[PDB]
Amino acid sequence: SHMRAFEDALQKLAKAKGFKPERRPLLEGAFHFITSSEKPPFLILQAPTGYGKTLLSYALAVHSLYDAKLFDRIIHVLPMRSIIEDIQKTAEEAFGFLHLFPLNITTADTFTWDLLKLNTKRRHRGYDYLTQASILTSLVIFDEAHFLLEDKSMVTAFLSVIEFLTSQKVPIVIMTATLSEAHKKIFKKYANKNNYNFKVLDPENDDPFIKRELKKDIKIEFNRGDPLNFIEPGRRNAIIVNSVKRAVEIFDRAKNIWPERDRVMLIHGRMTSSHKRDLINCLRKWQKEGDFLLIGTQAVEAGIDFSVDLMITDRAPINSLIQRFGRVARYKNEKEGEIIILEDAPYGPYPEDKVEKTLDLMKRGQILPRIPETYQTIVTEVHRSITKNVNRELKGELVRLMKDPSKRAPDVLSAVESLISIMRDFLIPLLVEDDMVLITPRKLLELYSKELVEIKGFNKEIKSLEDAYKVAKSVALGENIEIIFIGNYDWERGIP
Ligand SMILES: [Mg+2]
């Protein structure tokens, strides 16, 4: 068979995560398809949530220590909002990995900023990689992060970094429990355009994982109102919600409602990196010892590994709902669970038409999770029509500037400024005393008006969002400015 790097990963992972080895048949075939692969591979691994898909990411990384003919490292891309301190906490404690790491964990927007030759330095803090070329020599795995095509303000950019990435024949693995026919079509398009070896691996009808999960009885319900109406002390409770301000307010009251205040916890992305690390430590500990109440945003749906007896969720598109369902009865001997979707919840970042279409389509065809047969039809029907709002000319220019070595960030920013800009989603580093928090340009203005932000090396006093967008323009150009937080960082609530 001649694949020891896969065995080495399956053993070291099964020890640090304390589970006894299982088969996981698709993963070995997926590993072999990438390594042999006469032509550059474009694998779409479409497996249910909680399958163990991240094992292939660890396997291909160990394989890079022994052979780098196809790729010298594994770049592992998580969705934009997601929290990456969990997988980093596993790539460190299990495998012990400007320095070349065999496995790098970036996020969806940071990835496209790098391919556009923009500055992402403080996000990478030594540093793992800081260069567009370090990406092109690697194998990039999109872990539930291709859903940036669903973000209206991000379609043109991320479509350009898919056209450019395939134009360089970079090996690409796409991991998703939610693969619409519309997405498989765009990926097969650029895979066929650049002579890849396209492939889609989804489990068989006799797959042991899906059989084991059908023995699980987990009901899903609908309701309205305050999510604290449905908490159940004595069980593991999780309330996942569509915005951070909403998550802080639910936690501000769940402090005093839950029987043991010690077992209440808030997690979201507007926190320092070390604070997230501490919460992952406190959360792995509670996973073995009794009950708790976890309150979080979408950030914990992709990156964090936890199982919860009862799940209370805002209404959301089917992609993030399937992700959030995946943390109810996730482990082996967990057979009973409960899900309650709040259909009256605020949308937040999500498009309104999409969240209502999943809510309707779900109610007709009652689904049970981790069984793609039930939710696959809703997936293909909601996540479509991407090409409506693609700037086909700006997309052509971005792929032009990315291909040209003599074009740097000023050429990318000025060309984008002519077709303030997409910059609205370019998060900027807010400096908390020692750590750092990524915030939006809009959030920077709100904090400057409250007189909590001090900007060194920059003159304009920030009002009128266009001014805040200009600070992001400076950070992207790598200018010697520091956006510093003056107030006291709340070690529980994060940044407002
Ligand atoms: Mg994952």
Short mmCIF file of C-alpha atoms and ligand atoms in Angstrom, two decimals:
data_model
loop_
_atom_site.label_atom_id
_atom_site.label_comp_id
_atom_site.label_asym_id
_atom_site.label_seq_id
_atom_site.Cartn_x
_atom_site.Cartn_y
_atom_site.Cartn_z
CA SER A 1 0.00 0.00 0.00
CA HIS A 2 2.98 2.25 0.80
CA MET A 3 1.23 4.98 2.79
CA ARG A 4 2.77 5.35 6.26
CA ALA A 5 2.16 9.09 6.67
CA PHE A 6 -1.56 8.30 6.81
CA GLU A 7 -0.98 5.62 9.46
CA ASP A 8 1.27 7.93 11.48
CA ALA A 9 -1.48 10.57 11.53
CA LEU A 10 -4.30 8.15 12.38
CA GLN A 11 -2.30 6.87 15.37
CA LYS A 12 -1.03 10.17 16.80
CA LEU A 13 -4.51 11.68 16.38
CA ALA A 14 -6.30 8.70 17.97
CA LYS A 15 -4.07 9.05 21.04
CA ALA A 16 -4.32 12.80 21.66
CA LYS A 17 -8.09 12.73 20.98
CA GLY A 18 -8.49 9.50 22.96
CA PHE A 19 -10.65 7.58 20.49
CA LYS A 20 -9.85 4.05 19.43
CA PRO A 21 -8.96 3.66 15.74
CA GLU A 22 -11.82 3.05 13.31
CA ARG A 23 -11.89 2.34 9.58
CA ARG A 24 -12.71 5.72 7.97
CA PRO A 25 -12.53 4.20 4.47
CA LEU A 26 -13.01 7.30 2.30
CA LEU A 27 -10.03 9.03 3.91
CA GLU A 28 -7.47 6.43 2.81
CA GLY A 29 -8.81 6.51 -0.74
CA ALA A 30 -8.75 10.30 -0.64
CA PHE A 31 -5.13 10.22 0.55
CA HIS A 32 -4.13 7.86 -2.26
CA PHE A 33 -5.93 9.89 -4.94
CA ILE A 34 -3.92 13.00 -4.04
CA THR A 35 -0.50 11.35 -3.71
CA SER A 36 -0.50 9.30 -6.93
CA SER A 37 -2.46 11.71 -9.12
CA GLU A 38 -0.62 11.82 -12.48
CA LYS A 39 -2.28 15.19 -13.09
CA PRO A 40 -2.81 17.84 -10.37
CA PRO A 41 -5.72 16.68 -8.21
CA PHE A 42 -8.89 18.65 -7.47
CA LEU A 43 -10.61 16.49 -4.85
CA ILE A 44 -14.05 17.34 -3.46
CA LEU A 45 -14.42 15.31 -0.25
CA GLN A 46 -18.17 15.46 0.47
CA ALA A 47 -18.55 13.70 3.82
CA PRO A 48 -21.05 14.20 6.66
CA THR A 49 -20.13 16.44 9.56
CA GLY A 50 -18.09 14.75 12.27
CA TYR A 51 -16.77 12.17 9.80
CA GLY A 52 -13.15 12.89 10.69
CA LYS A 53 -12.33 14.77 7.50
CA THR A 54 -9.56 16.74 9.23
CA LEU A 55 -7.52 13.51 9.40
CA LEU A 56 -6.73 13.77 5.68
CA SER A 57 -5.39 17.26 6.41
CA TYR A 58 -3.07 15.85 9.08
CA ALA A 59 -2.08 12.91 6.87
CA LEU A 60 -1.03 15.00 3.86
CA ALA A 61 0.98 17.25 6.20
CA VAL A 62 3.06 14.38 7.60
CA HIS A 63 3.52 13.16 4.02
CA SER A 64 5.09 16.52 3.15
CA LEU A 65 7.90 15.86 5.64
CA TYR A 66 8.92 12.87 3.50
CA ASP A 67 8.11 14.03 -0.05
CA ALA A 68 7.33 17.47 -1.50
CA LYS A 69 7.19 16.75 -5.24
CA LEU A 70 3.54 17.83 -5.38
CA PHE A 71 3.35 20.19 -2.39
CA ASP A 72 5.75 21.42 0.29
CA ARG A 73 3.13 22.14 2.98
CA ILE A 74 -0.59 21.91 3.76
CA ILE A 75 -2.46 25.21 4.03
CA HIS A 76 -5.72 24.52 5.89
CA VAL A 77 -8.36 27.18 5.25
CA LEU A 78 -11.26 27.73 7.68
CA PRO A 79 -14.28 30.00 7.01
CA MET A 80 -13.94 33.73 7.69
CA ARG A 81 -15.78 34.05 11.02
CA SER A 82 -14.41 30.73 12.30
CA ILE A 83 -12.12 30.36 15.31
CA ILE A 84 -8.85 28.62 14.40
CA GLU A 85 -7.38 28.27 17.92
CA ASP A 86 -8.96 24.81 18.21
CA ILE A 87 -7.26 23.10 15.26
CA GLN A 88 -4.06 24.95 16.16
CA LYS A 89 -4.50 23.47 19.65
CA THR A 90 -4.57 20.02 17.99
CA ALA A 91 -1.80 20.44 15.41
CA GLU A 92 0.40 21.41 18.38
CA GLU A 93 -0.59 18.96 21.14
CA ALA A 94 -0.91 15.92 18.83
CA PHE A 95 1.76 16.24 16.12
CA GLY A 96 4.16 18.87 17.49
CA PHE A 97 4.53 20.93 14.33
CA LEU A 98 9.25 33.18 9.19
CA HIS A 99 9.31 29.40 9.42
CA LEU A 100 8.04 26.58 7.20
CA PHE A 101 5.40 24.60 9.07
CA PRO A 102 4.08 21.39 7.44
CA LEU A 103 0.51 22.35 8.43
CA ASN A 104 -0.74 25.95 8.41
CA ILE A 105 -4.19 27.06 9.56
CA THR A 106 -5.41 30.27 7.91
CA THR A 107 -8.91 31.66 7.45
CA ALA A 108 -10.92 32.31 4.32
CA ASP A 109 -10.53 36.08 4.05
CA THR A 110 -6.89 36.11 5.18
CA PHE A 111 -6.21 33.54 2.45
CA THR A 112 -7.59 35.69 -0.38
CA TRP A 113 -5.83 38.80 0.94
CA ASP A 114 -2.53 36.91 0.75
CA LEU A 115 -3.14 35.75 -2.83
CA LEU A 116 -3.84 39.41 -3.65
CA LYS A 117 -0.38 40.27 -2.24
CA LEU A 118 -1.86 42.38 0.56
CA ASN A 119 -0.47 42.63 4.10
CA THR A 120 -1.71 40.11 6.68
CA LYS A 121 1.36 40.16 8.92
CA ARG A 122 -0.09 40.49 12.42
CA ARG A 123 -2.61 37.71 11.71
CA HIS A 124 0.21 35.22 11.10
CA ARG A 125 2.13 35.97 14.33
CA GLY A 126 7.62 34.08 14.43
CA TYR A 127 5.35 33.78 11.39
CA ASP A 128 4.15 30.77 9.43
CA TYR A 129 3.99 32.35 5.97
CA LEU A 130 3.79 35.90 4.66
CA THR A 131 4.03 35.52 0.89
CA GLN A 132 1.85 34.66 -2.11
CA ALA A 133 4.54 32.26 -3.33
CA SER A 134 4.43 30.23 -0.11
CA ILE A 135 0.81 29.46 -1.02
CA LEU A 136 1.45 28.49 -4.65
CA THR A 137 3.97 25.79 -3.66
CA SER A 138 1.53 24.20 -1.18
CA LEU A 139 -1.61 22.09 -1.21
CA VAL A 140 -4.56 24.22 -0.08
CA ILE A 141 -7.49 22.53 1.69
CA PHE A 142 -10.74 24.50 1.89
CA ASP A 143 -12.50 23.22 5.04
CA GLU A 144 -16.11 24.45 4.79
CA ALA A 145 -14.64 27.78 3.63
CA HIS A 146 -15.81 27.85 0.00
CA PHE A 147 -19.05 29.42 1.27
CA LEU A 148 -17.45 32.83 0.78
CA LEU A 149 -19.17 32.68 -2.62
CA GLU A 150 -22.40 33.17 -0.65
CA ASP A 151 -21.18 36.49 0.82
CA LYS A 152 -22.37 39.11 -1.67
CA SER A 153 -19.42 41.42 -0.96
CA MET A 154 -16.92 38.55 -1.34
CA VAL A 155 -17.98 36.66 -4.48
CA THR A 156 -15.76 38.51 -6.96
CA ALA A 157 -12.62 38.31 -4.81
CA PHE A 158 -12.88 34.66 -3.75
CA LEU A 159 -13.87 33.66 -7.29
CA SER A 160 -10.68 35.35 -8.48
CA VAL A 161 -8.55 33.41 -5.97
CA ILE A 162 -10.18 30.22 -7.26
CA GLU A 163 -9.52 31.10 -10.91
CA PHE A 164 -5.95 32.19 -10.11
CA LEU A 165 -5.26 29.23 -7.81
CA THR A 166 -6.31 26.71 -10.46
CA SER A 167 -4.47 28.67 -13.16
CA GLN A 168 -1.24 27.84 -11.31
CA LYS A 169 -2.36 24.18 -11.04
CA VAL A 170 -2.11 24.30 -7.25
CA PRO A 171 -3.47 21.07 -5.69
CA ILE A 172 -6.84 21.74 -4.08
CA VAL A 173 -8.91 19.66 -1.65
CA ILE A 174 -12.44 20.84 -0.84
CA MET A 175 -14.01 19.46 2.33
CA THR A 176 -17.72 20.03 2.90
CA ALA A 177 -20.77 18.34 4.38
CA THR A 178 -22.81 20.74 2.23
CA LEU A 179 -22.07 20.58 -1.51
CA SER A 180 -24.64 22.15 -3.82
CA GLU A 181 -24.71 21.27 -7.51
CA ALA A 182 -24.11 24.97 -8.19
CA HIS A 183 -20.81 24.88 -6.27
CA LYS A 184 -19.65 21.57 -7.76
CA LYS A 185 -20.26 23.20 -11.15
CA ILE A 186 -17.99 26.22 -10.60
CA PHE A 187 -15.25 23.98 -9.20
CA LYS A 188 -15.47 21.46 -12.04
CA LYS A 189 -15.37 24.43 -14.43
CA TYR A 190 -11.98 25.72 -13.28
CA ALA A 191 -10.69 22.18 -12.69
CA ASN A 192 -11.54 21.27 -16.29
CA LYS A 193 -10.30 24.65 -17.55
CA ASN A 194 -6.78 23.98 -16.20
CA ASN A 195 -6.63 20.21 -16.92
CA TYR A 196 -6.92 19.00 -13.32
CA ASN A 197 -7.88 15.45 -12.32
CA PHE A 198 -11.35 16.16 -10.95
CA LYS A 199 -13.02 13.82 -8.46
CA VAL A 200 -15.86 13.83 -5.92
CA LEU A 201 -15.77 11.36 -3.02
CA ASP A 202 -18.97 11.03 -1.01
CA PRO A 203 -19.61 7.99 1.21
CA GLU A 204 -21.32 4.82 0.06
CA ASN A 205 -24.79 3.60 0.96
CA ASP A 206 -23.29 0.93 3.26
CA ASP A 207 -20.89 3.40 4.90
CA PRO A 208 -20.40 2.47 8.58
CA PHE A 209 -20.46 6.10 9.77
CA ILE A 210 -23.94 6.84 8.40
CA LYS A 211 -25.27 3.51 9.71
CA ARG A 212 -23.95 4.31 13.19
CA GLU A 213 -25.56 7.76 13.06
CA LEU A 214 -28.98 6.41 12.05
CA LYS A 215 -29.04 4.53 15.37
CA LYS A 216 -29.01 8.01 16.97
CA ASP A 217 -32.33 9.64 17.88
CA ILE A 218 -31.96 13.43 17.85
CA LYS A 219 -35.10 15.51 17.31
CA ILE A 220 -35.25 19.03 15.88
CA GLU A 221 -37.99 21.50 16.78
CA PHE A 222 -38.99 25.11 16.19
CA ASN A 223 -39.91 27.85 18.67
CA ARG A 224 -39.68 31.60 19.24
CA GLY A 225 -38.44 34.06 21.81
CA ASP A 226 -35.57 34.42 24.22
CA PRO A 227 -33.21 31.42 23.82
CA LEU A 228 -33.01 31.12 27.62
CA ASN A 229 -36.63 29.90 27.62
CA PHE A 230 -35.41 26.43 26.66
CA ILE A 231 -32.22 25.77 28.66
CA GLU A 232 -32.03 22.47 30.56
CA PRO A 233 -29.78 22.29 33.64
CA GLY A 234 -28.41 18.81 34.21
CA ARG A 235 -27.42 18.49 30.54
CA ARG A 236 -24.77 19.92 28.24
CA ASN A 237 -26.34 23.08 26.80
CA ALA A 238 -25.24 25.19 23.83
CA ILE A 239 -26.84 28.38 22.52
CA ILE A 240 -25.33 29.34 19.15
CA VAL A 241 -26.46 32.67 17.73
CA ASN A 242 -26.05 34.82 14.63
CA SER A 243 -24.32 37.88 16.14
CA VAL A 244 -21.86 38.78 18.88
CA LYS A 245 -23.77 41.65 20.54
CA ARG A 246 -26.68 39.21 20.83
CA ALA A 247 -24.34 36.56 22.26
CA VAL A 248 -23.00 38.99 24.88
CA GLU A 249 -26.52 39.93 25.99
CA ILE A 250 -27.66 36.31 26.38
CA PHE A 251 -24.48 35.59 28.36
CA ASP A 252 -24.93 38.69 30.54
CA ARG A 253 -28.13 37.07 31.87
CA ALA A 254 -27.14 33.40 31.68
CA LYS A 255 -24.47 34.32 34.23
CA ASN A 256 -27.05 34.46 37.03
CA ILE A 257 -29.69 32.06 35.66
CA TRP A 258 -27.59 28.91 35.26
CA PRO A 259 -27.25 26.99 38.56
CA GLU A 260 -23.42 27.00 38.58
CA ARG A 261 -21.99 30.25 37.23
CA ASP A 262 -18.65 28.48 36.73
CA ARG A 263 -20.22 26.37 33.94
CA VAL A 264 -21.25 29.33 31.75
CA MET A 265 -18.99 30.37 28.88
CA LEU A 266 -19.04 32.83 25.95
CA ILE A 267 -17.00 32.37 22.76
CA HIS A 268 -16.90 34.63 19.70
CA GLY A 269 -14.39 36.04 17.25
CA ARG A 270 -14.07 39.57 18.66
CA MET A 271 -11.72 38.30 21.38
CA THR A 272 -7.96 38.14 21.83
CA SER A 273 -6.16 35.06 20.55
CA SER A 274 -5.01 33.93 24.01
CA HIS A 275 -8.52 34.34 25.44
CA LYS A 276 -9.79 31.88 22.83
CA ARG A 277 -6.93 29.52 23.73
CA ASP A 278 -8.00 29.63 27.38
CA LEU A 279 -11.62 28.91 26.46
CA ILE A 280 -10.66 25.92 24.31
CA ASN A 281 -8.72 24.59 27.31
CA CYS A 282 -11.68 25.15 29.64
CA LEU A 283 -14.03 23.57 27.08
CA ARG A 284 -12.06 20.37 26.44
CA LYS A 285 -12.04 19.96 30.23
CA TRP A 286 -15.81 20.31 30.64
CA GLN A 287 -16.37 17.90 27.74
CA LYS A 288 -15.42 15.01 30.04
CA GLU A 289 -16.72 16.42 33.36
CA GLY A 290 -20.47 16.91 33.54
CA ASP A 291 -22.81 19.60 32.27
CA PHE A 292 -22.37 23.25 31.24
CA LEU A 293 -23.91 26.04 29.15
CA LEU A 294 -21.97 27.26 26.11
CA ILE A 295 -22.96 30.54 24.44
CA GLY A 296 -21.40 31.42 21.11
CA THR A 297 -21.70 32.83 17.62
CA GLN A 298 -21.15 31.19 14.23
CA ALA A 299 -17.40 31.28 14.95
CA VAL A 300 -17.60 28.02 16.94
CA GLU A 301 -19.54 26.07 14.31
CA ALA A 302 -16.64 25.01 12.06
CA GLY A 303 -13.40 25.10 14.05
CA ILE A 304 -14.32 23.90 17.55
CA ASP A 305 -14.84 20.23 18.49
CA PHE A 306 -17.53 19.71 21.13
CA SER A 307 -20.66 17.65 21.77
CA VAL A 308 -23.72 19.03 23.53
CA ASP A 309 -26.87 17.34 24.83
CA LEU A 310 -29.23 20.16 23.80
CA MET A 311 -28.75 22.72 21.05
CA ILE A 312 -30.56 26.07 20.69
CA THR A 313 -29.97 27.87 17.41
CA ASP A 314 -30.95 30.98 15.52
CA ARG A 315 -32.43 30.36 12.09
CA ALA A 316 -29.70 30.34 9.46
CA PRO A 317 -28.98 28.96 5.97
CA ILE A 318 -28.73 25.20 5.63
CA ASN A 319 -24.92 25.26 5.43
CA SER A 320 -24.37 26.72 8.91
CA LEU A 321 -27.35 24.85 10.37
CA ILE A 322 -25.92 21.50 9.25
CA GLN A 323 -22.64 22.66 10.80
CA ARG A 324 -24.37 23.60 14.06
CA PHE A 325 -26.40 20.37 14.12
CA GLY A 326 -23.11 18.46 13.91
CA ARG A 327 -22.29 19.24 17.56
CA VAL A 328 -25.36 17.67 19.20
CA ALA A 329 -24.72 13.91 19.22
CA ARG A 330 -21.25 13.94 17.71
CA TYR A 331 -19.40 11.17 19.54
CA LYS A 332 -19.79 7.39 19.57
CA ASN A 333 -22.06 6.46 22.50
CA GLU A 334 -24.20 9.63 22.40
CA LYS A 335 -27.61 8.50 21.15
CA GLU A 336 -30.17 11.08 22.35
CA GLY A 337 -30.15 14.77 21.49
CA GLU A 338 -32.42 17.76 21.00
CA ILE A 339 -32.34 20.71 18.60
CA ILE A 340 -34.64 23.74 18.77
CA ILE A 341 -34.42 26.37 16.02
CA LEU A 342 -35.62 29.90 16.81
CA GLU A 343 -37.50 30.97 13.69
CA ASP A 344 -38.11 34.52 14.99
CA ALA A 345 -34.39 35.26 15.42
CA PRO A 346 -32.60 38.19 13.77
CA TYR A 347 -30.87 37.33 10.51
CA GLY A 348 -27.59 39.11 11.12
CA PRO A 349 -25.01 38.64 8.37
CA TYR A 350 -27.12 36.05 6.54
CA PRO A 351 -29.25 36.80 3.46
CA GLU A 352 -32.94 36.85 4.32
CA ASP A 353 -34.23 34.92 1.29
CA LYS A 354 -31.81 32.06 1.99
CA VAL A 355 -32.62 31.53 5.68
CA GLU A 356 -36.37 31.41 5.00
CA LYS A 357 -35.99 28.92 2.14
CA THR A 358 -34.17 26.47 4.41
CA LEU A 359 -36.75 27.02 7.16
CA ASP A 360 -39.56 26.16 4.74
CA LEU A 361 -37.81 23.26 3.00
CA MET A 362 -36.84 21.73 6.36
CA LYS A 363 -40.36 21.79 7.76
CA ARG A 364 -41.72 19.77 4.83
CA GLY A 365 -39.06 17.05 4.67
CA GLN A 366 -38.15 16.40 8.33
CA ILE A 367 -34.39 15.73 8.32
CA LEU A 368 -32.09 14.04 10.81
CA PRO A 369 -28.45 15.14 10.79
CA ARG A 370 -25.28 13.47 9.51
CA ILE A 371 -27.40 11.57 6.98
CA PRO A 372 -26.92 13.50 3.70
CA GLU A 373 -29.95 11.80 2.11
CA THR A 374 -32.19 14.01 4.25
CA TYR A 375 -30.61 17.45 3.78
CA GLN A 376 -28.94 17.14 0.36
CA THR A 377 -31.97 18.43 -1.56
CA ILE A 378 -32.26 21.54 0.63
CA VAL A 379 -28.54 22.15 0.07
CA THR A 380 -28.73 22.26 -3.73
CA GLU A 381 -31.88 24.43 -3.69
CA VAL A 382 -30.72 27.18 -1.32
CA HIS A 383 -27.04 27.56 -2.28
CA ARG A 384 -27.36 28.52 -5.94
CA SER A 385 -27.32 31.56 -8.24
CA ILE A 386 -23.83 32.71 -7.26
CA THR A 387 -22.98 34.29 -10.63
CA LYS A 388 -25.68 36.98 -10.21
CA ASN A 389 -23.42 39.48 -8.44
CA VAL A 390 -19.95 38.68 -9.82
CA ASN A 391 -18.02 41.65 -11.23
CA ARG A 392 -16.73 39.72 -14.24
CA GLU A 393 -14.37 42.54 -15.26
CA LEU A 394 -12.85 43.21 -11.83
CA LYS A 395 -12.48 39.44 -11.42
CA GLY A 396 -10.53 39.38 -14.68
CA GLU A 397 -8.23 42.17 -13.52
CA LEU A 398 -7.53 40.61 -10.11
CA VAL A 399 -6.41 37.36 -11.77
CA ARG A 400 -4.25 39.53 -14.04
CA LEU A 401 -2.51 41.34 -11.17
CA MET A 402 -2.04 38.11 -9.19
CA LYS A 403 -0.33 36.48 -12.16
CA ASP A 404 2.04 39.42 -12.71
CA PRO A 405 5.02 39.47 -10.29
CA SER A 406 5.68 43.18 -10.92
CA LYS A 407 2.23 44.08 -9.51
CA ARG A 408 2.10 44.63 -5.75
CA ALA A 409 -0.57 45.73 -3.27
CA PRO A 410 -0.82 49.35 -4.57
CA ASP A 411 -1.72 48.02 -8.02
CA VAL A 412 -4.31 45.66 -6.51
CA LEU A 413 -5.89 48.34 -4.31
CA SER A 414 -6.02 51.03 -7.01
CA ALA A 415 -7.45 48.61 -9.58
CA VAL A 416 -10.09 47.51 -7.08
CA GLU A 417 -10.77 51.21 -6.35
CA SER A 418 -11.83 51.60 -10.01
CA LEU A 419 -14.22 48.67 -10.55
CA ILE A 420 -14.55 52.35 -0.04
CA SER A 421 -14.25 49.12 -1.98
CA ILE A 422 -14.57 45.41 -1.13
CA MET A 423 -12.30 46.70 1.68
CA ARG A 424 -15.37 46.72 3.96
CA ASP A 425 -14.52 43.12 4.91
CA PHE A 426 -10.77 43.73 5.33
CA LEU A 427 -10.47 43.29 9.09
CA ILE A 428 -7.82 45.38 10.85
CA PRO A 429 -5.71 44.50 13.92
CA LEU A 430 -6.86 46.25 17.09
CA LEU A 431 -3.98 46.14 19.58
CA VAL A 432 -5.05 45.04 23.05
CA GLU A 433 -2.23 45.53 25.54
CA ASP A 434 -0.23 42.48 24.42
CA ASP A 435 -2.65 40.48 22.24
CA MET A 436 -4.64 41.39 19.12
CA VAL A 437 -8.29 41.45 17.98
CA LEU A 438 -9.44 41.59 14.36
CA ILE A 439 -12.27 44.10 13.91
CA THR A 440 -14.20 45.48 10.95
CA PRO A 441 -13.67 48.99 9.55
CA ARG A 442 -17.15 49.89 10.82
CA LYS A 443 -16.38 48.61 14.33
CA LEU A 444 -13.24 50.76 14.36
CA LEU A 445 -15.33 53.90 13.77
CA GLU A 446 -17.76 52.97 16.55
CA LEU A 447 -14.82 52.51 18.93
CA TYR A 448 -13.13 55.74 17.82
CA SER A 449 -16.30 57.76 18.43
CA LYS A 450 -16.38 56.30 21.96
CA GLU A 451 -12.73 57.47 22.24
CA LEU A 452 -11.25 54.01 22.82
CA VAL A 453 -8.86 53.78 19.83
CA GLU A 454 -5.51 55.55 19.43
CA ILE A 455 -3.93 55.43 15.97
CA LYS A 456 -0.18 56.05 15.77
CA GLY A 457 1.39 57.07 12.48
CA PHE A 458 -1.93 58.20 10.98
CA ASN A 459 -3.41 61.68 10.99
CA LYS A 460 -7.08 61.68 9.96
CA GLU A 461 -9.41 61.49 12.96
CA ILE A 462 -11.76 58.63 12.09
CA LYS A 463 -15.37 59.57 11.41
CA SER A 464 -17.46 58.89 8.30
CA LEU A 465 -16.74 55.20 7.48
CA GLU A 466 -14.78 56.12 4.32
CA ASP A 467 -12.13 57.32 6.79
CA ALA A 468 -12.19 53.92 8.52
CA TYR A 469 -11.94 52.18 5.13
CA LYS A 470 -8.80 54.25 4.55
CA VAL A 471 -7.14 52.87 7.69
CA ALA A 472 -7.75 49.37 6.32
CA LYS A 473 -6.14 50.57 3.08
CA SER A 474 -3.03 51.50 5.08
CA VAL A 475 -2.85 48.18 6.93
CA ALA A 476 -3.21 46.33 3.61
CA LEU A 477 -0.32 48.37 2.19
CA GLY A 478 1.81 47.49 5.23
CA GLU A 479 2.20 51.03 6.56
CA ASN A 480 3.84 51.57 9.95
CA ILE A 481 0.65 52.35 11.87
CA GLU A 482 -0.66 50.93 15.14
CA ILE A 483 -4.36 50.76 16.02
CA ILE A 484 -4.28 50.54 19.82
CA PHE A 485 -7.12 49.96 22.30
CA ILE A 486 -7.12 52.37 25.25
CA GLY A 487 -9.92 50.97 27.42
CA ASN A 488 -9.90 47.80 29.50
CA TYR A 489 -10.38 44.56 27.57
CA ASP A 490 -13.14 42.50 29.18
CA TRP A 491 -11.66 39.04 29.80
CA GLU A 492 -15.20 37.61 29.45
CA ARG A 493 -17.17 39.74 26.96
CA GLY A 494 -14.31 40.63 24.61
CA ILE A 495 -14.47 43.88 22.64
CA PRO A 496 -17.99 45.56 22.69
MG MG B 1 -13.26 21.05 11.18
#
